């Protein structure tokens, strides 16, 4: 649909985007009601009032899990002797199928800077880091320029707007691992270590970066913050009649007519996104599957296309909303090859810490390669199902491996015939030894 009207009331995140796809700098941002929410926060609201305001707005985590942001902010310690607090922006965004944070940071960097300013004032966080992936070169340039402009305009640094609040914002560019987006592994990479995740509890709100209170939030959550504090809680609760408040960047990608990204309210069905916004599938292509929220979510069928894009509805269907950036799979795509590609990514992006991911994802990769070459053997599908069961939530140290086995689960559940078509050889892992008669098991 070309006729998209981006009013500031209905499109808080994208109404000040430019038609020539150019970044909005400080003069244009402040012309379009920029840093008004930051001014209201810093000059007329206590940090606890801002935390409760975000909690009452119902801002959920836009990184994929949907944890409540006000609840995460309220879990910082009430001890006044801890004042070395850190606010981290997870600008990693390494999930295959996810490109929303790239748009947000490339074209609206001051929105992210303002959201970090408001959130850092609410959390009493003296320092802030944007943990940005190393491949977003233009995002790094735009974010550093926006931080320099906000520093020269007095919006960052010492004594911001005369309030006495000190906030320093850094941009830390990454060195390319998918596990660096997991928040405790993000904290470990921020400290110059290998990016292994950490066991929770303790959560980073009490013991995070360098043992201090730390809050890790996605780019899009912090970008939702300034509109909440500039327009109010009631406005944020009165733009969607769904249990997930506010707007979300959703989009369809992969062999559709118009792959892209649009800001939509929660409860928008996947079918209307795919048809009205993405334009439907391309010419001579038949829709066969879709992933709702990136490479770590379960595949869904055509019958699930009428589901509203919410956490509860997609969760009730045997998947999860994720990043809400769906990927469409046409009939010309073989599911065994697609899942082999997915598991190859997931197995080589293991951090190596815990046994089931590190040593059973490569086993799934090798089974899928055998099925893709037609050299599958009996027991391979059962081994894949056992791998799916035993890499679920709680069995592995972090959540990388359950997300890895979600597409394998759903592809075996729905498109099992391709997987059974992979099996063509009799089972064997023993060669014959000459003087020894084998134990012929039944």
């Amino acid at each position: 649909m070309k006729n998209i009207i981006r009013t500031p009331e209905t499109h808080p995140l994208t109404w000040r985007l430019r038609d020539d796809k150019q970044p909005v700098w400080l003069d244009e941002y402040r012309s379009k009601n920029g840093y008004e929410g930051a001014r209201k926060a810093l000059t007329g609201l206590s940090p606890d009032e801002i935390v409760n305001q975000v909690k009452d707005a119902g801002l959920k985590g836009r990184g994929g899990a949907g944890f409540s942001t006000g609840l995460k902010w309220s879990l910082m310690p009430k001890d006044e002797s801890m004042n070395i607090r850190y606010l981290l922006c997870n600008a990693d965004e390494m999930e295959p199928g996810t490109y929303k944070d790239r748009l947000l940071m490339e074209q609206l960097p001051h929105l992210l800077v303002e959201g970090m300013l408001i959130s850092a004032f609410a959390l009493k966080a003296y320092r802030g880091y944007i943990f940005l992936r190393g491949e977003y070169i233009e995002a790094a340039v735009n974010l550093r320029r926006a931080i320099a402009e906000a520093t020269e305009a007095g919006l960052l640094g010492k004594n911001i707007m005369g309030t006495g609040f000190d906030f320093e914002l850094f941009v830390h560019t990454g060195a390319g691992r998918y596990i660096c987006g997991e928040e405790t592994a993000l904290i470990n990479s921020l400290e110059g270590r290998r990016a292994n995740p950490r066991s929770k509890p303790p959560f980073p709100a009490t013991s995070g970066a360098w043992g201090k209170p730390t809050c890790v939030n996605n780019v899009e959550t912090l970008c939702n913050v300034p509109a909440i504090l500039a327009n109010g809680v009631e406005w944020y609760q009165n733009i969607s009649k769904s249990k997930d408040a506010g707007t979300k960047l959703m989009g369809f990608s992969g062999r559709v007519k118009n792959p892209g990204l649009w800001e939509l309210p929660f409860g928008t069905t996947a079918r209307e996104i795919l048809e009205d916004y993405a334009g439907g599938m391309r010419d001579g292509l038949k829709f066969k599957a879709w992933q709702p929220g990136g490479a770590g979510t379960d595949f869904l069928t055509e019958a699930h296309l009428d589901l509203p894009m919410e956490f509860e509805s997609i969760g009730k269907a045997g998947s999860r909303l994720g990043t809400a950036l769906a990927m469409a799979v046409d009939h010309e795509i073989n599911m065994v090859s697609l899942v082999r590609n997915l598991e190859e990514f997931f197995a080589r992006e293991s951090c190596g810490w815990c046994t089931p991911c590190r040593d059973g994802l490569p086993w799934s990769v090798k089974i899928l390669r055998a099925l893709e070459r037609g050299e599958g053997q009996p027991g391979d599908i059962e081994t894949l199902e056992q791998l799916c069961r035993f890499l679920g939530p709680g069995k592995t140290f972090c959540a990388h491996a359950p997300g890895a086995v979600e597409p394998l689960q759903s592809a075996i559940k729905y498109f099992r015939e391709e997987f059974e078509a992979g099996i063509k050889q009799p089972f064997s892992n023993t060669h014959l030894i000459n003087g020894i008669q084998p134990n012929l098991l039944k």
């Binding site: 691992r177 290998r194 066991s199 197995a347 080589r348 992006e349 293991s350 951090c351 190596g352 810490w353 815990c354 046994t355 089931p356 590190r358 040593d359 059973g360 490569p362 086993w363 090798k366 055998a370 053997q377 027991g379 081994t383 056992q386 035993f390 709680g394 069995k395 592995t396 140290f397 064997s428 892992n429």
Partner: protein
């Protein structure tokens, strides 16, 4: 604290984890990454038990006993079928890449990986693909290095670095090519590097001085000495 393991009531220390509490009670739970002196990290995922919410709970949930406090009124099962299957699966995943080395390995008959392989009851290989391999380093006159036999339990680095404060041993690489050794060949500089040969549950780090005149642990005549 009061715990219930397989319906049997035990009195434990509530400040302990379930793995050390259950090993102190004489129960057997397989484990690799945990050590009594190094603490619990939850790496190897071997020590899984099934925790129930109360006595009138039947579903339960697989938890790591080394990362779970043995708090009052705990209900766990070691002999649960799903827990036993998971522990056998963890041994199987470690066995997929493990070299066919037991006869020519100085750890044989004295190897914790052998013991936990047998204890889970895993004796059938259904993995048919290739094993990853590794080059070995020269670690000096005392310690022999065989990185093929590693199970990435992280005991060596946690001991040598977080306990003994040695600087020249670490973990390198990534996903399933994780390497445990020095950054280059040379003598291990810690005065307490020799404890690796007992800290390492496999035959990666072995006593080179013993390896010169090797014999198995059953062939040894021991005495308590100072």
């Amino acid at each position: 604290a009061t715990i219930h393991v397989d319906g049997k009531e035990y009195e434990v220390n509530g400040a302990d984890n379930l793995l050390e509490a259950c090993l102190s009670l004489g129960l057997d739970i397989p484990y690799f990454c945990w050590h009594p002196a190094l603490g619990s990290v939850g790496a190897c995922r071997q020590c899984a038990v099934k925790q129930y919410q109360n006595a009138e709970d039947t579903r339960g949930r697989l938890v790591m006993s080394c990362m779970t406090p043995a708090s009052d009124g705990t209900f766990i099962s070691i002999d649960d079928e799903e827990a036993k299957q998971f522990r056998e699966s963890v041994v199987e995943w470690l066995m997929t890449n493990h070299p066919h080395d037991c006869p020519v390995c100085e750890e044989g008959g004295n190897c914790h990986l052998q013991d936990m392989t047998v204890m889970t009851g895993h004796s059938f290989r259904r993995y048919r693909f290739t094993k990853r391999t590794h080059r070995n380093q020269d670690l000096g006159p005392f310690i022999s290095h065989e990185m093929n036999r590693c199970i990435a339990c992280y005991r060596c680095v946690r001991y040598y670095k977080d306990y003994a404060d040695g600087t020249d041993l670490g973990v390198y690489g990534a996903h399933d090519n994780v390497y445990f050794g020095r950054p280059e060949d040379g003598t291990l500089e810690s005065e307490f590097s020799g404890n690796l040969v007992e800290i390492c549950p496999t035959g990666v780090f072995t006593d080179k001085t013993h390896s010169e005149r090797y014999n198995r642990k059953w062939d040894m005549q021991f005495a308590p000495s100072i």
